[PDB]
Ligand binder design. Sequence first.
Ligand SMILES: NC(=O)N1CCN(C(=O)c2ccco2)CC1
Length: 171
Amino acid sequence: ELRVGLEESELWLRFKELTNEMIVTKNGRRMFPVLKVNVSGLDPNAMYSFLLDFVAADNHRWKYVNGEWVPGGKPEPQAPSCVYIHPDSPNFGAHWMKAPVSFSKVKLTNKLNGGGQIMLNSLHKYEPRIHIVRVGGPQRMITSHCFPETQFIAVTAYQNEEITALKIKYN
Ligand SMILES: NC(=O)N1CCN(C(=O)c2ccco2)CC1
C-alpha cells in the first residue's frame, strides 16, 4: 500500500496552533517550513512525478483583527491553484523513497508570472496537497494527499509576530 507521511509534523503543528502564514511577493517567495514528504510502497522500478498544489480551504478573505484572524462574510468561488512539479520529476520509485521529497524550490507569488512560481490570492487560507502520478507505464495512476498540518494564510507581510518569531527561531 502507497503510504504518504509529513516529515517534521512536530514543527508544522507549532505553526498551525498559531495560524500559519506564508509570504507571497510579485517575484515569488520560498516556503518555511518546507513541505517534506515520506513516501513508501511505490514500485522502485516504476516512473513517478510529484506534483504540488494549494487547495483554497474555504471561500473567504481573512483579516487580522485585534490579534486574531477572522474570515469575511462575502465568500467567492476560489479558482484552483496551478500545479508545481518537483524538480526530480520524472524519476524511479526508488529515487522518491530513498529520502523525504522536499519542495524547497516552490515559490508562492501574488502575480500571474513567467514560470515556476505558483500564484495564490493574498488573505486566503490554503491546504497543501500533492499528487503522485505514475507516468510512462501502460496504466497511468494518481494518488493524492492533503496535509492539514501545513495549512496557512497567504500574506504580503506577517501579521502575528508569534509566527515571525517561530519562522526565525527554526530557520
Ligand atoms: N520539463 C518539463 O517540461 N516537464 C514535463 C512534465 N514533468 C513531469 O514530470 C510530469 C509528470 C506529470 C506532469 O508533469 C516535469 C518536466
